[PDB]
Amino acid sequence: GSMDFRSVFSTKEGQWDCSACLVQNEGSSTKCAACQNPRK
Amino acid sequence: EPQVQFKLVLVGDGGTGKTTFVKRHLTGESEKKYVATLGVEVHPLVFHTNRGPIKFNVWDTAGQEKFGGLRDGYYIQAQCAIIMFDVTSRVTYKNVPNWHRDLVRVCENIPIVLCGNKVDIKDRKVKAKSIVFHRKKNLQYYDISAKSNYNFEKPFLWLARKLIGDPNLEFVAMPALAPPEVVMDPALAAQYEHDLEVAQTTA
Ligand SMILES: Nc1nc2c(ncn2[C@@H]2O[C@H](COP(=O)(O)OP(=O)(O)O)[C@@H](O)[C@H]2O)c(=O)[nH]1
Ligand SMILES: [Mg+2]
Ligand SMILES: [Zn+2]
Known about the structure:
The structure holds two protein chains of two kinds.
Chain A: H1 5-8, E1 16-17, E2 24-25
Chain B: E1 4-12, H1 18-22, H2 26-30, E2 33-35, E3 40-49, E4 52-61, H3 72-75, E5 80-86, H4 90-94, H5 96-107, E6 112-117, H6 128-133, E7 139-143, H7 154-164, E8 171-173, H8 186-201
Parallel strand pairs in B: 1-4, 1-5, 5-6, 6-7
Antiparallel strand pairs in B: 2-3, 3-4, 3-8
The structure holds guanosine-5'-diphosphate, magnesium ion and zinc ion.
């Protein structure tokens, strides 16, 4: 009931989603660890 | 705002039906992304669970698997995998350990589902007794037919349960799937389901 993702799920602080391949990357990375696309 | 999502790598020999399979999910096909640096199509597949939506971002090759291993970037940050073979081609089943080795080498103990595709075809060569005889611990197996949507949701539900750590997780509705191109014969499905159950329980 209260285990719904909207209530309990959150992403790491500063995390960014690669616009090219959707991999989730560290705030400290300038480029995607998988496909090398640069952070926006 | 944030949405639960996982990178899923779909691997297995060329011609086993990987691309046909991922494409059954209609919205994943219309929203797919082409990754030029790696020659990959990433299909964002949403499934609606009793706890909300989850997205499997499925990595489908552009055929390079025919010419040796895939590059590391294909595997990097994978959170789960499907290994596919073709139940009409014993060679594709014999290569399963090789894909499994490559996966663990880069991704260690991520959850993996093994899928035997094309079970709609009557002249089946890799049968349940052989698949169960070679069953690997933690390597969950399903019969699938991409072309008929047969068992489409099962690999994803099993992985979701493992990733979330919730054995009671359910899909509340099926995704919108491309209409079946071939009929999965009901008598054949019932036989294969029986053969699997027998192999899994027989002493
Ligand atoms: N009868 C049957 N044919 C399939 C199925 N899935 C794929 N095929 C065919 O197998 C061939 C290779 O399919 P493809 O998706 O390109 O395989 P991939 O190389 O692993 O991506 C194609 O002719 C498909 O039409 C299935 O479930 N049943
Ligand atoms: Mg393909
Ligand atoms: Zn990327």
